[PDB]
Amino acid sequence: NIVLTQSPASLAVSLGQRATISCRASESVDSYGNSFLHWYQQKPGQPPKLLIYLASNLESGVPARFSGSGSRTDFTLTIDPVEADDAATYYCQQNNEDPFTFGSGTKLEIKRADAAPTVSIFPPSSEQLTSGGASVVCFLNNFYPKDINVKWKIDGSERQNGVLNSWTDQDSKDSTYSMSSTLTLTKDEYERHNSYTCEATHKTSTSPIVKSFNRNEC
Amino acid sequence: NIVLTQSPASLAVSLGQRATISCRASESVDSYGNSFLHWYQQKPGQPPKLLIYLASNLESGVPARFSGSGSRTDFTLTIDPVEADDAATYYCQQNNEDPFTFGSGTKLEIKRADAAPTVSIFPPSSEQLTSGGASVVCFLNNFYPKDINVKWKIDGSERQNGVLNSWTDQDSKDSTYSMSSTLTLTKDEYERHNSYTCEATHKTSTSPIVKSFNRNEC
Amino acid sequence: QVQLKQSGPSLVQPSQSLSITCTVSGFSLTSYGVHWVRQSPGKGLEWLGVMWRGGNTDYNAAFMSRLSITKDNSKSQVFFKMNSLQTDDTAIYYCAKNGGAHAMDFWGQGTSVTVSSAKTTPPSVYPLAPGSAAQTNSMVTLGCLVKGYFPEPVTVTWNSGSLSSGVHTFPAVLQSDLYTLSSSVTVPSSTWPSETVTCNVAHPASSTKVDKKI
Amino acid sequence: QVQLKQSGPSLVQPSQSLSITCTVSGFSLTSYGVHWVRQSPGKGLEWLGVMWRGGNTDYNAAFMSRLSITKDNSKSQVFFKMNSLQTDDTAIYYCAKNGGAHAMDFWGQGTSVTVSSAKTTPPSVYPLAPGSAAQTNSMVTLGCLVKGYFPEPVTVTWNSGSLSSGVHTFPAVLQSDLYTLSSSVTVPSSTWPSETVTCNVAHPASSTKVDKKI
Amino acid sequence: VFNATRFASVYAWNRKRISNCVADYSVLYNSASFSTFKCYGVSPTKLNDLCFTNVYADSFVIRGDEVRQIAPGQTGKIADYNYKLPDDFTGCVIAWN
Hints:
This is part of a larger assembly, with two copies of chain A (218 residues), two copies of chain C (214 residues) and one copy of chain E (97 residues). Chain C is an all-beta fold.
């Protein structure tokens, strides 16, 4: 058995720099005539692909920016320069002994400049109001870093019952993040107060992100 | 006050399978880096003991078959391999907010092979009959499943006043069911007829398991 | 080495007070707090209180004014003071050591605290011998009838606990300030009426021990 | 040119079995051994097994007794039979072509196999339509709220996938035996409310197509 | 150090600094008295003859399901909060029931 304790668990490397994804192994020797392994990539918005075979060779379909080498246990995956195609999880696989397990997985994050999110609020549809429900969504997309917290504040009192968030990972190409905050309530809650407030606090926006929506938006 | 809606309320898992028991929660969240809870196992004749703490760490002193995981709200208990000594209930404890309440409680039973009950009846002592009462005990032990209709039927007609059963559920050591039926009658009713009948109908046995006794057996 | 047993309560009358003594051993009482719980009345397991590691004590909204916990660090004994006990306040208490993440690592034996206006009724033990028509299949059932006792707990066995695997236990029926307990013991068919079958009973509340031969 | 996508399972309970059908294209089954893996269920990527070229097959140490590979050389399809699955095994299962040094050169799209005791439920789609008071600045965002479906996946597109400029797919929020999926797409203002817009939602687990006009 | 009286805890692990001596590792690897013998950065058969400036012997006790957690970059409650092994750890770890 080979325990590929790949490290680190995640990286924050900006564009144009050198990212280092190490991969620790225990066994074995003489893969083909040496102690090399294969590297792979698993993107969140695209199927996976093979980057480096035998840890020293290039593969068609991917750029030549991926390189590296490795000893019996100390392996290295060098991505130099980092462009906007690297936001994904990287793995290392030994094939000289069953099971052909992979590494722990290094989630490389493209450390671009800080960017504020978009602003878009969607009142409920006619079918929702007809059925008595009212689900409002306050989207905050195209931002960096992923650290974002939405506070659904109704003018009467802050509501935190039906608050759900969808934290989308960094797309392979689009280096920005995307998060959607929902609030599923009844029609009486939507018709409770004239105005409402979608509050949020992001690292980029020093001022509190505030966008209101009225009950008459139908 | 968090009412941990522990589901399922009961399970009949056979030998060699994997039992899965959930535990719902709603508060709190992100105490330090998670909001995991604990698990316990209460026997029918002994208070419970700690199996898993923080839903991801094993505790010594108990069998190693118990494990589990959990999200911030849903916590899972994994019992693998299910053996013939895991005939007991389970619980999950609230720890993030006081009071340290528990869940509903899942009653796990081992699906053993079918078996017929014993055939024997026990009349009372001479002192009980002399005082005016009568306590005849009719045992139906070491049977499976628990689906058995026990009802006293005196020679005159079906009895509905002195009917009383004491059901013993599946024990850890004894994986079979046991039920002791009692008969509450007076001296005259005990000596009203010559023979009486302790009638019972088991699920697998189409014919009723009966055992009669005479008033002179004392 | 580890001991969390309880003693003291036998039977309580309505509108009275009483304290339970749970002896602590096997661990530093100053480093770990003792929990208190009930035996699942109605819904799942109910929790009463716990003394912190030299801090404060937690209670429920309904039991903060009536029940109290006292942790004696010198004698290694945690006391559970009960106040204003009424007939509907029946409960079976247990002690348990506090763990790291507020866990319950060790557990005790507990005690059954019954509250009722009725007086202590000792058990009317009688032997359950099989009738003449009862047959054998290389095994014979023998039991002891512990009927007409109040309150819980009670222990019935064979030869003062000589056999523990063949002795079966049944639940006691709850009557009007009374109980009816049935029991049975599996033995070989050739061991009765040949061998002496002495059944022992123990009622800790009334301190009654009636021996009856089957 | 190459296709290694999976299909067949909709929803499975824990401690049960299933059957997956992976359609192989681009290479003959006799030329390369189809591999079989998962998609990061918690910890790192997990390897399951591989069927060699007309010979035996290797399996994972933790899945040799439970999981099995059934390779059909006549239909150009590799079938997989799994047994005794747990909720933690929920992940996308992939098929891949063998490389030179036992590598996985090509990778497919796979299928998101979900293990959970809950039952299947179709999606109750409700569109996120801006009201009449909604404003626009040279563009308008649109989306749908697909709540009340189980299990994953669910594909939300804009007019059968006509739009691809600002399409953003969000993860499904695990509810009580249900899921909640949101979406957000960026389209110029000349398409809505001018042209006909309709949310197209597909649930491959139930093969349901829900159309809701935005 | 291995045959010491009592080891320290997992969080107060005792770092025994050793220097200026001869260390035979092939006799220990071929002793057949260790439950686990897994090295990182160099094989146990090759590190027997190597010169170093300083070596350490960290004494602690952990459960059978926990010995697999002591590795470079391996997660775990003891691996992150009690004993953090270096990610570039070029030494060796041993254990015995």
